[PDB]
Structure formats: C-alpha cells, structure tokens
Amino acid sequence: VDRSNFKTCEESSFCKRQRSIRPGLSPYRALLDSLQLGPDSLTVHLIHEVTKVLLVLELQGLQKNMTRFRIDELEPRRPRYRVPDVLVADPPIARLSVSGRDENSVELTMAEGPYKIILTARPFRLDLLEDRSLLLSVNARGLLEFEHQRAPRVDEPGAWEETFKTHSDSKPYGPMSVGLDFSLPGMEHVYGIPEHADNLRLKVTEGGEPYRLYNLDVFQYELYNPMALYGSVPVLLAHNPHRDLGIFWLNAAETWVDISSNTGETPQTDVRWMSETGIIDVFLLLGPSISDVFRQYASLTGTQALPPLFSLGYHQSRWNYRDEADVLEVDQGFDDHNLPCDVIWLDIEHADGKRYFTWDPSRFPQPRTMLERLASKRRKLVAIVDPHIKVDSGYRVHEELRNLGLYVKTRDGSDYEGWCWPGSAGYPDFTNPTMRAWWANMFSYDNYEGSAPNLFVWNDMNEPSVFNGPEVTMLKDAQHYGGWEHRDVHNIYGLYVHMATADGLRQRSGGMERPFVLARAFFAGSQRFGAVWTGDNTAEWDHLKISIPMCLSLGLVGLSFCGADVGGFFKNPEPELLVRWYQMGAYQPFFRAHAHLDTGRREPWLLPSQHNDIIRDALGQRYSLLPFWYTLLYQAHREGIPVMRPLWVQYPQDVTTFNIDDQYLLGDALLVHPVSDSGAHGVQVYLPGQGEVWYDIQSYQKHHGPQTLYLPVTLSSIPVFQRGGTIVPRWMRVRRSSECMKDDPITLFVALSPQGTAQGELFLDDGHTFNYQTRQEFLLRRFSFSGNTLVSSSADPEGHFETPIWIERVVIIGAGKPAAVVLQTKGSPESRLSFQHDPETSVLVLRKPGINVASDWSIHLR
Amino acid sequence: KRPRGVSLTNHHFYDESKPFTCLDGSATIPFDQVNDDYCDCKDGSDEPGTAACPNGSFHCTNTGYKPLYIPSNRVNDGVCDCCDGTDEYNSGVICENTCK
Numbered sequence: 001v002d003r004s005n006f007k008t009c010e011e012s013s014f015c016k017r018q019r020s021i022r023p024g025l026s027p028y029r030a031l032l033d034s035l036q037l038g039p040d041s042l043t044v045h046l047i048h049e050v051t052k053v054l055l056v057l058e059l060q061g062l063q064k065n066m067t068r069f070r071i072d073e074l075e076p077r078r079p080r081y082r083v084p085d086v087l088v089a090d091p092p093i094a095r096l097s098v099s100g101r102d103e104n105s106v107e108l109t110m111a112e113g114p115y116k117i118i119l120t121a122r123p124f125r126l127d128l129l130e131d132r133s134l135l136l137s138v139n140a141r142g143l144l145e146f147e148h149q150r151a152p153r154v155d156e157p158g159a160w161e162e163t164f165k166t167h168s169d170s171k172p173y174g175p176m177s178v179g180l181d182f183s184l185p186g187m188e189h190v191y192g193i194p195e196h197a198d199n200l201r202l203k204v205t206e207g208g209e210p211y212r213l214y215n216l217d218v219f220q221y222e223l224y225n226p227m228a229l230y231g232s233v234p235v236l237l238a239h240n241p242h243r244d245l246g247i248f249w250l251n252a253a254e255t256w257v258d259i260s261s262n263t264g265e266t267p268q269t270d271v272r273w274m275s276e277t278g279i280i281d282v283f284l285l286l287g288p289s290i291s292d293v294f295r296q297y298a299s300l301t302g303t304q305a306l307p308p309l310f311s312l313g314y315h316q317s318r319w320n321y322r323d324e325a326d327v328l329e330v331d332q333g334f335d336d337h338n339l340p341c342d343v344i345w346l347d348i349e350h351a352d353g354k355r356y357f358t359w360d361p362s363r364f365p366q367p368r369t370m371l372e373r374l375a376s377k378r379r380k381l382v383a384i385v386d387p388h389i390k391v392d393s394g395y396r397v398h399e400e401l402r403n404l405g406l407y408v409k410t411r412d413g414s415d416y417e418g419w420c421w422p423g424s425a426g427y428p429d430f431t432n433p434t435m436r437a438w439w440a441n442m443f444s445y446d447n448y449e450g451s452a453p454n455l456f457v458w459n460d461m462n463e464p465s466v467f468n469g470p471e472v473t474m475l476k477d478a479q480h481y482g483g484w485e486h487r488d489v490h491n492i493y494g495l496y497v498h499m500a501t502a503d504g505l506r507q508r509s510g511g512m513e514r515p516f517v518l519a520r521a522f523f524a525g526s527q528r529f530g531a532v533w534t535g536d537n538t539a540e541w542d543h544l545k546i547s548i549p550m551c552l553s554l555g556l557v558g559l560s561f562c563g564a565d566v567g568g569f570f571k572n573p574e575p576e577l578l579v580r581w582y583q584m585g586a587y588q589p590f591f592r593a594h595a596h597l598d599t600g601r602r603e604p605w606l607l608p609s610q611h612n613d614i615i616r617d618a619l620g621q622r623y624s625l626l627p628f629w630y631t632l633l634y635q636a637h638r639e640g641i642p643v644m645r646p647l648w649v650q651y652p653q654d655v656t657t658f659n660i661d662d663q664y665l666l667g668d669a670l671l672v673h674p675v676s677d678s679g680a681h682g683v684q685v686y687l688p689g690q691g692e693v694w695y696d697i698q699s700y701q702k703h704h705g706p707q708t709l710y711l712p713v714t715l716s717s718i719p720v721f722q723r724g725g726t727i728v729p730r731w732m733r734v735r736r737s738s739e740c741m742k743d744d745p746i747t748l749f750v751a752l753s754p755q756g757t758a759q760g761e762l763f764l765d766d767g768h769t770f771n772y773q774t775r776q777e778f779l780l781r782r783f784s785f786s787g788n789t790l791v792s793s794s795a796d797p798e799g800h801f802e803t804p805i806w807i808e809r810v811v812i813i814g815a816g817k818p819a820a821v822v823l824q825t826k827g828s829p830e831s832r833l834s835f836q837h838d839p840e841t842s843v844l845v846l847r848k849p850g851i852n853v854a855s856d857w858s859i860h861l862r
Numbered sequence: 863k864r865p866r867g868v869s870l871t872n873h874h875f876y877d878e879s880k881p882f883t884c885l886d887g888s889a890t891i892p893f894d895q896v897n898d899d900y901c902d903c904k905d906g907s908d909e910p911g912t913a914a915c916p917n918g919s920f921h922c923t924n925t926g927y928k929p930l931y932i933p934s935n936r937v938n939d940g941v942c943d944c945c946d947g948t949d950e951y952n953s954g955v956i957c958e959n960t961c962k
C-alpha cells in the first residue's frame with residue numbers, strides 16, 4: 001500500500017488536536033442545578049471552566065441492561081449531525097430514579113434493576129455500577145473534548161482550511177471534533193471496530209496511531225496495522241471471565257479509537273474515541289454476558305438479515321467474462337467436472353463501458369437468454385452496480401440523476417463529478433432518502449433491462465471510492481442531503497448504498513423474494529441488508545491467516561455473513577495456497593472466489609488432479625453442511641449471535657481462548673482450525689471446555705478438553721471437530737447447486753456428551769422467499785438425545801412448513817451397540833430400524849428412518 | 863424388466879429373485895434395497911437409478927444418441943441431462959425426446 005496517500009493521526013487535524021489533550025483534571029464539570037429528571041431521560045449541563053461554554057448531557061436507561069447518553073451543546077449555533085437509519089427502532093426506556101443525592105454526586109438506579117449510575121459534578125465523571133461493583137467509568141481520565149462552533153475565522157494549523165496532498169478541504173465550520181474516554185476496570189481484552197487488518201484482540205495504541213474508522217478504498221492493503229479499511233463499525237466489546245460490556249459510539253464521521261491499559265493493581269483498559277463532528281452518542285451494553293451484549297446490540301442496530309439459501313453455497317468470479325460465451329463455458333465447466341456452483345459473478349467489464357443497469361449489445365448480445373440457460377441449470381448471476389454514474393447524453397441514469405438533483409454537490413454547489421473508471425463519474429447522494437427510492441426503483445424488471453429473477457447485484461466501491469479525491473474518497477466539504485457535509489456522513493454512505501440496493505432487489509419481486517447484496521463499505525446496522533467481504537486482499541499465506549480474525553471481528557458486531565476472496569485478489573497464488581483457501585472458504589459464511597486482470601484463470605478445474613479433487617471435496621463439505629449454515633444464519637437472524645464466533649464467546653471463563661484467532665466456532669457445534677502454512681505437516685488445535693469431548697469430523701476420534709492436540713494434516717484435511725453434545729444436520733447428496741439440494745434427504749450427525757446427551761436445531765424454508773415471516777412457512781426442529789432416545793420436536797410451534805425432506809440416516813458418534821433400534825411416530829406401528837455399528841470409531845449408523853422432518857418421532861436405542 | 867439406471871450390459875447382475883450383490887463385492891443386500899433411495903452399497907451399485915449414492919451412475923439409453931452414464935447426483939435434479947430424459951422421473955420436471 002502507498003502509506004503516503006491516507007492521513008495518519010498527525011495528518012488528521014482534529015486527531016492531532018484531540019490526542020494532544022492528556023489525562024488530567026477534566027475542565028468539564030456537571031452543574032447539578034440544571035439536573036432535570038424527565039420521564040424518559042436525565043438532562044444535565046456541563047460547563048467548561050476555562051471556555052465557559054456549556055454542553056448538554058442526556059442520560060437514558062434502556063430496558064435491556066443498557067444506557068444511552070448523548071453529549072451535545074446547549075446553544076448549538078449550527079445543528080450537529082445525529083446518525084439516522086442505524087438504530088432499527090427507538091430503544092425502549094428504563095426510567096432513572098435518584099437512589100441518593102450529594103453535594104457533589106448523584107446516583108441513579110435504572111428502573112428497579114441492580115444498575116446505578118453515579119454522576120459526579122467536579123469534575124464530570126459518569127460511574128456505571130452493578131450494585132456495588134464498578135463496570136465502566138465515563139470521563140474518568142479527563143479526556144472529554146467537545147470543540148464548539150467557532151466564530152467564522154477562515155490558533156492552530158489545520159483547524160480550518162487544510163490541504164492533505166493536493167486536495168483542498170475548506171472547513172466552513174472549523175473545529176467541531178468530539179471526544180470521550182471510557183475506563184473499563186478488570187478488562188484487558190477488547191474486540192470489535194472491524195475492518196482493520198489486525199488480530200481479533202485489539203492492541204494498545206499508546207506508542208502508535210489509533211484505530212481509524214473511515215471507509216476507504218485501500219489499494220493493496222497490508223496487515224497488522226490500524227489503518228482504516230473499507231468498512232467501519234464503531235462497536236467495542238470488552239471481555240472478562242465474569243462480566244462483559246460493550247461501547248457503541250454512534251458517529252458516522254471519521255473516528256479514531258485510542259486503546260490504553262494500565263501496567264498494576266486491578267487491570268484496566270481505557271478506550272478513547274475522537275470523532276470529527278456530530279454529537280457524543282454512546283450506547284453502553286452492560287452484559288452481563290457475551291450472548292447478552294450481542295442481543296442488546298441486535299436490539300439497537302438490527303440482526304443479520306437471513307440470506308437466501310443459494311448465497312450460502314459457492315460463488316465463482318473471474319475478473320469479468322469476455323462475453324456470454326465465457327459465462328456459458330464456466331457454467332459448463334462446473335457441470336462437467338461435477339463441481340457444485342451456485343452463482344456466477346460478473347465484474348465491471350460486463351457493463352456498457354462501465355455503465356451499470358444495462359448490458360452492451362455486442363459484449364452481451366442477449367442478456368436475458370443468458371440467465372435463461374443459467375436458470376435451466378439452476379444457477380444465479382451477479383452483476384456489478386456501483387454508485388458512480390458515467391456522464392453521457394445517452395445514459396438514462398445520468399440524465400435522470402442530474403435532472404432530478406440527487407448527486408452529491410461540492411463546496412460551491414455544483415454536482416460532484418470525480419473521475420472514476422466510468423469516465424467522469426458523478427457520485428449520487430445516497431444519504432438522500434428520495435434518491436435511495438429512485439435507486440431502488442431502477443432494479444425493477446422494466447428498468448433493469450436484461451434482468452431475470454436469478455440476477456442479483458453486488459455494489460463494489462460504495463465507500464465512495466473517488467479516484468481524484470482526498471485519499472481515495474470524496475472531499476469532506478462535499479454537501480450532502482439536508483445541508484450536511486460529507487465529513488458528517490462518510491461512514492453512513494456505504495450503509496445507504498447497501499440499503500438502497502437491498503430494497504431495490506427486494507421490491508422487484510414485490511417483497512416476496514429475499515435479496516442478496518454484497519458490499520465493501522458498511523457501518524453499524526449493515527447486517528440487515530446482505531453480506532460484506534473483506535475487500536481486495538492479496539493471495540499470500542499471511543492474508544489467508546488473517547481471513548479468520550477479520551471475519552471473527554465482523555461477526556462480533558452483527559455482520560455474521562462475512563467472507564474473504566478465495567484465492568486472493570492480488571499476486572496470484574500457488575496451487576497449494578489456492579487449495580488451502582478453498583478449505584477455509586468452505587467454512588466462512590461467505591464463500592466466493594475472485595480474480596484480477598493481472599492474475600490468470602483460477603478456476604478449480606484447471607488445477608492438478610490431486611489439487612482438484614481436494615477442492616471438489618472441500619466444496620462438497622460446504623454443500624453438505626449447508627443445512628447447518630442455514631440454521632446458523634437463522635440464529636444470527638433471530639438472536640444476533642454470530643455464525644462465525646470466537647472460542648471465548650462459548651467459553652467465557654477460559655483465559656486461554658482470549659487471544660485465539662486461528663480457530664473459530666461455527667455455532668456451538670463445530671470447531672474449525674483451517675490449515676494456513678506452506679507444507680504444514682500438523683496443526684495445533686486447542687480443544688476447550690472442562691469435561692468436553694470433541695470428535696474429529698472425519699475420523700470420529702474423541703478428545704477430552706481442555707487440551708492442545710497436535711493434529712497431523714495433509715493437503716486433503718480440513719481440521720473440523722464436532723462438540724460432544726451437538727447434532728449437526730447435513731445434505732449428503734451433493735448436487736450441482738443448492739436448488740434441488742433444498743429438497744434432499746437430511747442426515748443427522750449426533751455427537752454424544754459424556755453424559756450421553758446431545759442437542760441440535762434444524763431450520764428449513766423455501767430458501768428464497770420472505771414466506772418464513774409473513775405466512776410463517778418455516779420449520780425449526782429440535783433434535784435431542786437423552787438416555788438412549790433421540791427425539792425430534794418443534795423448537796417453534798408456529799412454524800408450519802410442508803417439505804419433501806425426510807431423514808435418511810442417523811449418525812450417532814460415541815454410542816454403543818444397541819442390539820435393537822426402534823422408531824416411534826404418530827400412532828403408526830413401531831417400525832424397527834436397521835443399523836450398522838462400527839466399533840473402532842464407535843459410530844452407530846441408523847439406516848433409513850424414512851420419516852419427514854416436519855413430523856415428530858423418537859428413535860429408541862433399545 | 864431391468865432396474866432403473868441399468869444398461870443391458872448391467873442387467874444380468876441384477877436379479878429380482880436373488881438377493882442383490884454389491885457388483886464389486888462388499889456385502890449382499892435384499893433386492894428391496896436396490897433403488898430404495900439409500901446407499902446400502904459402498905460401490906454405489908445398489909442405486910443405479912436414484913441419487914442416493916455419492917459414487918453411482920445412471921445409464922441413459924437413448925434411441926439415436928450415444929448411451930451415456932450421467933453421475934448419480936444428476937438424477938432427479940430438475941435439469942434434463944439425458945437426451946431422452948429418463949434422469950428425471952420424480953422431480954416434477956418433464957423433458958422431451960430430443961433424440962434427433
């Protein structure tokens with residue numbers, strides 16, 4: 001990467017000003033005479049003892065162990081930006097009541113629970129408590145900074161009109177940066193603020209640049225740096241074996257997060273946020289557990305939108321296809337080599353000279369009869385629709401985006417026309433709700449010509465990525481909808497593009513069919529619109545190792561549909577690295593292979609025979625586990641717990657799993673340690689849990705945790721383990737795609753706990769329609785194993801789905817010889833089931849239950 | 863009266879009267895288990911006509927076109943692989959006799 005192209009903290013004028021303030025007595029002190037306890041919120045006025053300009057602090061309890069507080073200014077002068085469309089709803093309120101009052105402090109219990117907020121007055125310092133235990137202190141070190149609207153002057157350099165490299169930023173409002181620090185006692189481990197190419201556990205930025213949250217088109221980004229990548233979610237989860245909190249800093253501007261920790265008595269982690277503008281909007285998630293803060297945050301921003309089933313499969317992308325012929329041959333090469341492929345993905349060259357919403361009459365002469373033979377083989381197609389619109393008299397999009405003023409406008413008031421690849425490209429105001437309504441209308445089957453129901457849309461470079469812009473983005477003085485500057489609305493722009501495209505793909509069917517959209521840039525609450533992937537990464541072994549932490553960190557903030565580019569994007573991989581990337585990618589939520597112009601063709605069937613059947617096995621494993629993926633994506637859709645989750649999420653008290661980013665958990669069942677080394681002869685897998693058994697998914701060999709086992713590996717081995725006490729559904733009949741697989745018999749792999757118990761869930765739906773919600777045509781089944789009985793019940797009684805899926809096989813791992821296996825059902829005679837028991841692996845295969853998944857049944861191991 | 867998915871060459875190894883053998887040799891199965899939609903045989907022999915085997919094949923005899931052994935995963939998949947679509951019979955998708 002070219003580091004002399006993006007701003008460090010010293011080159012960002014506000015960051016070098018906020019960071020200049022150092023821990024000391026806070027000049028901001030609360031005046032407990034304007035302390036006004038309304039029915040919803042407490043309002044107090046803080047004064048700056050030197051500046052003598054008073055801000056307004058609004059404290060608010062929330063009904064889910066939660067506290068939102070907003071620091072704005074009493075007399076605004078110019079209203080500051082408050083981020084919309086991120087919260088899925090107005091949070092419910094848990095009222096505050098004075099538990100006690102002092103000449104310097106006020107303690108406020110939240111509703112009637114164990115939480116009390118202690119607000120001191122000299123200096124201002126919020127102190128959240130649970131009964132008598134400190135949880136986190138706000139402004140404990142005296143780093144509350146709120147730069148008010150200065151009088152028009154254009155002192156310190158950069159506080160006004162500035163130039164980064166050659167691009168002017170004439171700030172008409174001067175310094176409006178905000179900042180605040182939170183001290184978390186007892187926490188040494190902090191996670192979140194995703195899209196940083198670093199480890200999952202954030203590092204202390206005491207002698208280096210802080211973590212930047214700025215949607216940037218970083219070309220060929222490196223790793224293990226705090227540089228801002230394509231996305232930004234300002235959520236920070238703290239972890240302890242006893243208590244786990246979270247800090248949600250709602251600000252759509254450029255944000256820097258400084259992580260600090262004491263050396264030294266009780267451990268403590270201090271997290272400092274500095275935003276360029278807006279107000280200080282902080283949600284505090286008081287746990288007390290990992291599952292609780294995920295549910296709280298999902299109640300704030302929203303849950304991961306349930307994807308269609310085909311998007312859970314394999315997507316193949318080259319750097320575009322030269323014509324319809326190349327798409328037809330790639331489909332035929334997936335069919336001929338019996339590889340399971342779901343979606344074929346088209347890049348920018350498919351557009352009419354980088355002009356989206358249309359196809360070239362010579363490059364793709366018959367666009368809608370290409371999807372017809374893609375739907376005959378039951379596969380999907382994904383195009384590219386990026387925000388920037390080319391300038392033409394013949395471009396209907398540009399002739400309507402300029403007639404109806406919906407473009408972003410520069411400082412003087414003319415339309416932004418940054419030179420992107422589509423010629424001179426005008427960037428539209430995706431902040432404008434009336435433009436997102438125009439954007440959504442143009443994905444219809446009449447507007448988008450050559451469009452079919454199997455045609456979906458991927459919005460690349462929605463940061464926005466302006467080629468002739470400061471860094472690689474739009475100028476910060478660009479005027480957006482509502483009079484807001486682009487400086488206020490940067491990180492929300494990608495979320496707005498994603499939302500508009502998702503509602504465009506939703507409403508073409510009429511709202512019936514689920515929309516799959518993939519975005520590079522995003523914000524908090526972008527889990528509700530589609531998938532996000534970790535930008536353009538090089539094809540090296542280090543970028544494959546870091547694939548897991550960037551998806552684990554993304555899953556922590558609700559974006560559980562994460563993935564990286566299989567085979568990289570730059571510096572075309574060796575065959576071994578391409579093989580190992582297809583094995584990891586099969587166990588990430590998003591599984592897409594993408595290529596570049598500089599790279600050759602990396603299709604799976606132009607590889608060595610040993611390197612092609614291994615990949616074919618890797619795709620078969622993912623498609624077989626697709627029922628597990630669909631169930632896991634439903635859990636993320638309901639309770640917000642990530643699909644790809646770390647090891648300390650399920651084992652909070654294990655102080656060994658805190659710094660683990662090479663293994664992950666696909667829910668509570670599967671532990672995955674994909675191999676990322678050149679010629680690795682073995683992996684070192686940490687199997688956690690006191691009194692837990694883990695079965696090798698291939699060899700069915702049980703290991704007792706907590707331990708660190710050396711698993712020797714070959715090129716054919718993906719180290720996946722099943723936790724003893726889980727039931728994993730599978731489709732063992734792998735077809736060409738997931739379109740007839742959705743009606744194929746289910747097999748249940750039952751791994752027994754040391755107490756002989758097991759539990760699992762299975763979610764079923766038509767896989768492509770919003771019918772599981774409006775008419776409740778879904779089916780959530782709970783499979784339990786206790787004693788010697790495997791019972792199937794409904795985990796949601798209102799889910800009534802009529803499916804042809806039956807149970808064709810039951811695999812009980814860790815069982816014994818039954819000598820009799822019976823199946824009981826709805827009054828029908830107890831039909832005895834045949835069984836084969838392998839004694840070396842201790843695996844009992846119950847043959848052909850032959851029973852529909854909808855009906856309840858009980859297998860008795862008599 | 864050959865079982866589904868079997869060529870005339872493959873039709874004498876399958877006998878209705880006798881228990882079916884794995885056709886390569888692992889174990890014998892009752893004939894009710896041939897084409898029963900379950901992978902009784904490791905070879906995949908028991909299910910020539912169904913997609914129940916990860917290793918089986920469907921022989922498609924075409925009048926006027928070369929007989930072809932499609933993979934077993936292509937049977938009942940909603941796509942008409944064979945010229946005479948005998949591969950789809952219970953999938954709800956009907957094919958045409960394109961054997962010209």
Ligand SMILES: *[C@@H]1O[C@H](CO)[C@@H](O[C@@H]2O[C@H](CO)[C@@H](O[C@@H]3O[C@H](CO)[C@@H](O)[C@H](O[C@H]4O[C@H](CO)[C@@H](O)[C@H](O)[C@@H]4O)[C@@H]3O)[C@H](O)[C@H]2NC(C)=O)[C@H](O)[C@H]1NC(C)=O
Nearest residue numbers: 063064065113114130286287288289291292293295296653
């Ligand atoms: C909102 O906050 C409330 C209050 O913080 C919270 O309710 C609390 O839930 C926790 C977790 O369930 C409870 O803590 C438990 O207390 C019991 C009794 O002392 C203990 O036995 C439990 O120990 C378990 O955890 C061990 C960890 O090693 C395990 O080995 C094993 O499971 C133990 O049994 C545990 O400490 C706490 O008592 C309640 N408190 C109250 C007042 O209810 C609630 O869950 C939060 N809700 C939301 C919406 O977030």
Ligand SMILES: [Ca+2]
Nearest residue numbers: 936941943949
């Ligand atoms: Ca077929």
